[PDB]
Amino acid sequence: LAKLGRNLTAEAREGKLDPVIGRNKEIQEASEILSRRTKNNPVLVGDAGVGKTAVVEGLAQAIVNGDVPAAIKNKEIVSIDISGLEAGTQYRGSFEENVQNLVNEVKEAGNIILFFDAIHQILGAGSTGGDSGSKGLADILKPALSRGELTVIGATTQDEYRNTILKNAALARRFNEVKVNAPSAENTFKILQGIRDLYQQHHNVILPDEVLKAAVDYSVQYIPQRSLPDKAIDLVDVTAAHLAAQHPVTDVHAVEREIETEKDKQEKAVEAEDFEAALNYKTRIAELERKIENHTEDMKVTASVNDVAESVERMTGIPVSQMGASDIERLKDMAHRLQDKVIGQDKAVEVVARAICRNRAGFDEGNRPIGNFLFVGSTGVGKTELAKQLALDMFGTQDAIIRLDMSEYSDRTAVSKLIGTTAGYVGYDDNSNTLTERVRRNPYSIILLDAIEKADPQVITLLLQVLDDGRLTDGQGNTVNFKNTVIIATSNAGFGYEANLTEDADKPELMDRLKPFFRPEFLNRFNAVIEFSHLTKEDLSKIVDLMLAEVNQTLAKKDIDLVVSQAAKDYITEEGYDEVMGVRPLRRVVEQEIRDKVTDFHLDHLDAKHLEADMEDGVLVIR
Amino acid sequence: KAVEVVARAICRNRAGFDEGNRPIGNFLFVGSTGVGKTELAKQLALDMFGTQDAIIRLDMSEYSDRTAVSKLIGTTAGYVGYDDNSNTLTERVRRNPYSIILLDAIEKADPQVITLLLQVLDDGRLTDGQGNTVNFKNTV
Amino acid sequence: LAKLGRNLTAEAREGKLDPVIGRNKEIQEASEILSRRTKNNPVLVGDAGVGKTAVVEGLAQAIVNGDVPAAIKNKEIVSIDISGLEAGTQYRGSFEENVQNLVNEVKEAGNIILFFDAIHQILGAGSTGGDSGSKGLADILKPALSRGELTVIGATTQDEYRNTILKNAALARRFNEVKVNAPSAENTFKILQGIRDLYQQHHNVI
């Protein structure tokens, strides 16, 4: 049926396959794929182009070489291309007979195996979910499964397998589950030596062992993707692309165009039978051809392994050139690296970092999402620095984070004064535009529940009781499976007191103040809690030292950099350390005080490097 | 002193001294209708932009919590969706990413109605009801 | 496929292009556009007739003159006109075979690059937003992206790129983002001297 398709054993008989190894255990697991006499259609799993096809091609290779038992002797494999469904019908004719014509050859041809890369869409012409009623093959093959005539094999998503329950009588009573995969870095390296000999000749590049190791050992730290085993190709591909910026302009064709001229004269010298001239041209061209071929030797492509490691930053934008051998370095130092940029209490990192530590170390129970975190505080700096700064040390950019706005969950005001009514609480922020499509790209993300208190304890109770098993069944009956997800829930906290030096006198009573909108069943699921702790009349200058740095970092884009006095604090803090507000005035005073004065002197075209921001009597007079 | 508030924002932007992500900044004029209400927005538009194009007025009269029972334009449910992306909000914001916004008379509504826009102007970006993001440049 | 289109390198070989410069950094950024062996379909950005086509024409010029590495030697560029979709069918026949016939030449002809000025509408016959279900090319090319047969390149609005999330598996796992543009007035002036010699002769003006 490779007519109509691709005969995979025929390409195996011709040596057309990539002999990748280390996947031998999945060929060992293919001992049952080939041997089961009935009800024998497995359920493979893998990524798009993962190479689980290459396993079955590796199985086909095992069939050609006789590395298989006699149960599968002389059994051909053909890949049936369902993606070419309806091709050639013009949507005026029919295809369903070309499906029964797949059956009509192999039922009598005898000893045919059939293959697919990945299918769920076959059950469109069958029993499926959202794509029910569409065109497919199952209307012809679902009988073939029930009859036991055709066995067609291939992979899909393990969570897509849930639709077996729709027609379990045809699918559950004919299938057997495969153990998914185990892409270890140990077998990666031997493959990576196979990868260079496949690609390093493309760009005249050398990819030694330290580059292959660095392509995974250095990159694994910053790749949360399932596509890591092939990320090493991207790094050496982009490396050659960036190294190719050295020699894009060799005029190899300047000599080739000379040869085509001299050869064109040579052809005319021959027709005139002038062979002193014809020989002279063959003489020159031979030298000219040797000149071209020798240009290759002046274009050796050699990255340093440090340059390959720098490729990880160039096309990602993640400032990590300082690294590293950083399996442990990040575990211990990212916690210290955080607090250098934090404005608030210091014990918050020990709560959140340890969960990033024990997971990355691998010391975590068999089924736990990271753990449920609760930060009690108020809006602004205290609310957002933790989630933002963790995301930049964990993941580097503003991608793997979702904010759950409880403002859409106001029990008091949900009468469509704002976004909607009470009925808007369900369904939309369960799987709709857009929740799940971001959870699937980022199974691992930061969840932020913004300000718990807006709703009934049952609203908030739904998510947290369900995060025990790292799995949530949505309104449509589909299950989202959570990997390694951290939730930082947030509330509007505080406490009323006698004197500002007695704010921290009543420690557990913060939870009693916040009690009305939750219960101990909600509280006891959290990892000890992160406190309310306040802005102190203490080293305020650390905020001012960073803000002043943000001024010059902002001005540095136009090569503008002033001297800024540390005495700027003396006018800022006067409102800054007000316990009523916290860190509210800090940004408002600086962005008003300096910004306007530096603007007035750019008009005089004065060089910033010789101007000094020196305040006098609470007024900034830049020198 | 009203010009020193509004002109400086037209000055520091045009000079290029502005943080990496700020729409211009949020301004509030407390006053009453007539001359005091409208001269600032109109006269700034003629010195910034010269004609009656880059300016939208958000009528809070459509946001009366007390009277939205369809005595006038509509009910409470008319508060959402229409003055978020509908005929015509966004097609004017796309021609004029930079425009003057006028919120006419805050007091007509619940603080949560007015709170929506202003908490979202921090990053110069607003996600609408259809899941699309409007990106604000240099908007006052 | 310039039949059916416009062969941009052929017009580059004939000296039919406007040699605008100052955009060399976007040709330097086209070092990856030409060289990436797989998952190599960039995401350009620009204004309508901005001349980001002129960059790729400037890239085509770089290919003709050998100002490019060997990764892209003898690689032709053709502009495939999606705006002529359904042209000649009378809305009685079909076009989807004339799409598979774009594939059928270049898959075996070898060493063809394909171009578009600006596309979002391809995913109408695919996965898009408001214009989902309309006619397009993506039903034939989205497999071609997954297979790695055809790479077609061009620009759009950077905010329109948000629809990648709909079929990220075909689009996010096959694309790379371009740094948009930087039209400075410094390089404008040298162009402006090129603009007068192109137009000042039209009206006998200096």
SS (H, E, C) chain C: CCCCCEEHHHHHHCCCCCCCCCCHHHHHCHHHHHHCCCCCEEEEECCCCCCHHHHHHHHHHHHHCCCCCHHHCCCEEEECCHHHCCCCCCCCCCCHHHHHHHHHHHHHHCCEEEEEEECCHHHHHCCCCCCCCCCCCHHHHHHHHHHCCCCEEEEECCCHHHHHHHHHHHHHHHEEECCCCCCCHHHHHHHHHHHHHHHCCCCCCC
Comparing CA positions, the residue from B89, B100, B65, B93 lying closest to residue B79 is B65
Q: Are the CB atoms for A349 and A463 separated by under 8 Å?
A: no
Structure tokens at C129: 């937003």
Residue with the two structure tokens 């001005």: A555
Nearest CA in chain A to B84: A419
What is the C-alpha to C-alpha distance for residues A194 and A303, in angstroms, rounded to an integer?
19
Structure tokens at A146: 């029930």
Residue with the two structure tokens 């000055």: B11
Q: What is the widest separation between alpha-carbon atoms in chain C?
A: 57
Q: Are the CB atoms for C74 and C111 separated by under 8 Å?
A: yes
As to burial, measured by CB atoms within 10 angstroms (0-12 exposed, 13-18 middle, 19+ buried), residue A385 is middle
What is the C-alpha to C-alpha distance for residues A537 and A503, in angstroms, rounded to an integer?
13
Comparing CA positions, the residue from A134, A172, A174, A178 lying closest to residue A155 is A178
Which residues have C-beta within 8 Å of that of residue A614, sequence separation ≥ 6?
A565, A567, A620, A621, A622, A623
Quote the DSSP letter at residue A530: B
Strands of the C6-7 sheet, one edge to the other: C6-7, C76-79, C112-118, C152-156, C41-45, C175-177
Q: Are the CB atoms for A203 and A240 separated by under 8 Å?
A: yes
Given in angstroms, what resolution was this structure solved at?
6.3
Q: Are the CB atoms for A27 and A62 separated by under 8 Å?
A: yes
Before A316, cis peptide (omega within 30)? no
Residue B26 CA, chain-centre distance (Å), reads 9
Among the partner-chain residues A48, A83, A252, the one whose CB lies closest to the CB of C143 is: A83
Chain B: closest CA distance from residue C9 (Å): 36
Q: Are the CB atoms for A396 and A316 separated by under 8 Å?
A: yes
Structure tokens at C40: 């190599």
Q: Are the CB atoms for A585 and A578 separated by under 8 Å?
A: yes
What is the C-alpha to C-alpha distance for residues B53 and B74, in angstroms, rounded to an integer?
27
Chain C: closest CA distance from residue B134 (Å): 9
- Distance between first and last Cα of chain B: 18
DSSP-assigned beta bridge partners for residue B102: B57
DSSP-assigned beta bridge partners for residue A128: none
DSSP-assigned beta bridge partners for residue C143: none
Q: Are the CB atoms for A414 and A422 separated by under 8 Å?
A: yes
Residue A574 CA, chain-centre distance (Å), reads 46
Among the partner-chain residues B15, B110, B112, the one whose CB lies closest to the CB of A599 is: B15
Amino acid at A440: R
Q: Are the CB atoms for C81 and C115 separated by under 8 Å?
A: no
> Does any CB of chain B come closer than 8 Å to the CB of residue C186?
no
Render A191-224 in DSSP notation, one character per residue: HHHHHHHHHTTTTTB---HHHHHHHHHTTGGG--
Dihedral angle over CA of A513, A519, A520, A524, nearest 10 = -90
> Does any CB of chain C come closer than 8 Å to the CB of residue A250?
yes
Q: Are the CB atoms for B129 and B80 separated by under 8 Å?
A: yes
Amino acid at C185: A
Among the partner-chain residues A92, A237, A438, the one whose CB lies closest to the CB of C36 is: A237
> Does any CB of chain A come closer than 8 Å to the CB of residue B123?
no
Q: What burial letters (b/e) apply to A173-192, b meaning 16+ CB within 10 Å?
A: ebbeebeebebeeebbbebb
Chain A residues whose CB is inside 8 A of the C143 CB are 83
Render A430-477 in DSSP notation, one character per residue: HHSTTSHHHHHH-TT-EEEEE-GGGS-HHHHHHHHHHTTTTEEE-TTS
Which chains have 3 or more CB–CB distances shorter than 8 Å to chain B? A, C
Chain C residues whose CB is inside 8 A of the B133 CB are 159, 162
Chain B: closest CA distance from residue C30 (Å): 27
Nearest CA in chain B to A602: B15
Q: Are the CB atoms for A394 and A484 separated by under 8 Å?
A: no
DSSP-assigned beta bridge partners for residue C177: C43
Q: Are the CB atoms for A22 and A187 separated by under 8 Å?
A: yes
DSSP-assigned beta bridge partners for residue B133: B127
Chain C: closest CA distance from residue B88 (Å): 18
> Does any CB of chain C come closer than 8 Å to the CB of residue A363?
no
- Distance between first and last Cα of chain C: 42
Chain C: closest CA distance from residue B30 (Å): 36
Among the partner-chain residues B11, B109, B131, the one whose CB lies closest to the CB of A434 is: B131
Task: Tell if the CB–CB gap between A595 and B17 is shorter than 8 Å.
Answer: yes
Before A4, cis peptide (omega within 30)? yes
Length of chain B: 140
Q: Are the CB atoms for A187 and A20 separated by under 8 Å?
A: no
Q: Are the CB atoms for A594 and A564 separated by under 8 Å?
A: yes
Q: Are the CB atoms for A194 and A20 separated by under 8 Å?
A: yes
Helix (H) or strand (E) holding A169: helix A168-171
Residue A229 CA, chain-centre distance (Å), reads 13
Amino acid at A575: E
Chain C: closest CA distance from residue B132 (Å): 8
Q: Are the CB atoms for A56 and A115 separated by under 8 Å?
A: yes
Before A141, cis peptide (omega within 30)? no
Among the partner-chain residues B15, B80, B115, the one whose CB lies closest to the CB of A420 is: B80
As to burial, measured by CB atoms within 10 angstroms (0-12 exposed, 13-18 middle, 19+ buried), residue A61 is buried
Length of chain A: 623
Length of chain C: 206
What is the C-alpha to C-alpha distance for residues A214 and A209, in angstroms, rounded to an integer?
8
Question: Method used for this model?
Answer: cryo-EM
What is the C-alpha to C-alpha distance for residues A159 and A439, in angstroms, rounded to an integer?
14
Comparing CA positions, the residue from B49, B9, B20, B14 lying closest to residue B124 is B20
Q: Is the dihedral of CA A521, A527, A529, A530 positive or negative?
A: negative
Q: Which of A234, A247, A298, A311 to mutate to test the interface with C (most CBs of C within 10 A)?
A: A234
Q: Is the dihedral of CA B49, B52, B56, B61 positive or negative?
A: positive
DSSP-assigned beta bridge partners for residue A480: A472
State how far the alpha carbon of A166 is from the alpha carbons of A163, A172, A518, in Å.
6, 10, 39
Nearest CA in chain C to A240: C35
As to burial, measured by CB atoms within 10 angstroms (0-12 exposed, 13-18 middle, 19+ buried), residue A398 is exposed
Q: Are the CB atoms for A368 and A470 separated by under 8 Å?
A: yes
Nearest CA in chain B to C158: B135
Chain A residues whose CB is inside 8 A of the C31 CB are 241-242, 244-245, 248
Dihedral angle over CA of C30, C33, C34, C36, nearest 10 = 130
The β-bridge relationship of strands B133-135 and B125-127 is antiparallel
Q: Is the dihedral of CA A37, A41, A43, A46 positive or negative?
A: positive
Quote the DSSP letter at residue A113: E
Chain C residues whose CB is inside 8 A of the A249 CB are 66-67
Which residues have C-beta within 8 Å of that of residue A11, sequence separation ≥ 6?
A17, A57
CB pairs under 8 A between B and C: 4
φ/ψ of C91, rounded to 5, equals: 55, 30
Comparing CA positions, the residue from A510, A447, A457 lying closest to residue A484 is A447
Contacts 24+ apart (CB under 8 A), A250-258: A250/A295, A250/A298, A250/A299, A250/C66, A251/C66, A252/A292, A252/A295, A252/C66, A253/C66, A254/C66, A255/A288, A255/A291, A255/A292, A256/A292, A258/A288
Render B88-122 in DSSP notation, one character per residue: TSHHHHHH-TT-EEEEE-GGGS-HHHHHHHHHHTT
Chain C: closest CA distance from residue A436 (Å): 11
DSSP-assigned beta bridge partners for residue C112: C76
Comparing CA positions, the residue from B114, B88, B120 lying closest to residue B23 is B120
What is the C-alpha to C-alpha distance for residues C49 and C121, in angstroms, rounded to an integer?
17
Q: Are the CB atoms for A503 and A531 separated by under 8 Å?
A: no
Q: Are the CB atoms for A34 and A75 separated by under 8 Å?
A: yes
Q: Which of A409, A416, A437 to mutate to test the interface with B (most CBs of B within 10 A)?
A: A416
Render A477-494 in DSSP notation, one character per residue: S-EEE--S-EEEEEEE--
Helix (H) or strand (E) holding B59: strand B55-59
Chain A residues whose CB is inside 8 A of the B20 CB are 554
Q: Is the dihedral of CA A428, A433, A438, A443 positive or negative?
A: positive
Dihedral angle over CA of A274, A279, A280, A286, nearest 10 = 150
Q: Are the CB atoms for A459 and A522 separated by under 8 Å?
A: no
> Does any CB of chain C come closer than 8 Å to the CB of residue B127?
no
Quote the DSSP letter at residue A301: B
φ/ψ of A389, rounded to 5, equals: -75, -30
Nearest CA in chain A to C34: A241
Q: Which of B3, B26, B65, B112 to mutate to test the interface with A (most CBs of A within 10 A)?
A: B112
Comparing CA positions, the residue from A15, A23, A79, A29 lying closest to residue A51 is A23
Name residues 1-30 of chain C within 8 A of A (Cβ): 28
Residue C87 CA, chain-centre distance (Å), reads 21
Structure tokens at A80: 């049936």
DSSP-assigned beta bridge partners for residue A373: A488
The β-bridge relationship of strands A152-156 and A76-79 is unpaired
Phi-psi sector, C47: left (phi>0), alpha (psi -120 to 50), beta: beta
> Does any CB of chain B come closer than 8 Å to the CB of residue A566?
no
Amino acid at C93: G
Comparing CA positions, the residue from A205, A245, A249, A242 lying closest to residue C63 is A249
What is the C-alpha to C-alpha distance for residues C101 and C4, in angstroms, rounded to an integer?
11
Q: Is B75 helix (H, G, I), strand (E, B) or coil?
A: strand
Chain A: closest CA distance from residue B42 (Å): 25
Q: Is the dihedral of CA A154, A156, A162, A166 positive or negative?
A: negative
Which chains have 3 or more CB–CB distances shorter than 8 Å to chain A? B, C
Structure tokens at C105: 């030449």
Chain B residues whose CB is inside 8 A of the A596 CB are 8, 12
Among the partner-chain residues C31, C97, C169, the one whose CB lies closest to the CB of A244 is: C31
Amino acid at A421: T
DSSP-assigned beta bridge partners for residue C113: C77
What is the C-alpha to C-alpha distance for residues A406 and A449, in angstroms, rounded to an integer?
7
Comparing CA positions, the residue from A237, A243, A235, A238 lying closest to residue A299 is A243
Q: Are the CB atoms for B118 and B26 separated by under 8 Å?
A: yes
Task: Tell if the CB–CB gap between B76 and A599 is shorter than 8 Å.
Answer: no
Quote the DSSP letter at residue A535: P
Neighbours of A225 (CB within 10 A): 12
Dihedral angle over CA of C3, C8, C14, C19, nearest 10 = 160
What is the C-alpha to C-alpha distance for residues A568 and A574, in angstroms, rounded to an integer?
11
Q: After which residues is chain A broken (C to N over 2.5 A)?
A: none
Strands of the A486-492 sheet, one edge to the other: A371-377, A486-492, A446-450, A401-405
The β-bridge relationship of strands A471-473 and A479-481 is antiparallel
Q: Is the dihedral of CA A589, A591, A595, A596 positive or negative?
A: negative
Structure tokens at A600: 């007035």
> Does any CB of chain A come closer than 8 Å to the CB of residue C177?
no
Before B88, cis peptide (omega within 30)? yes
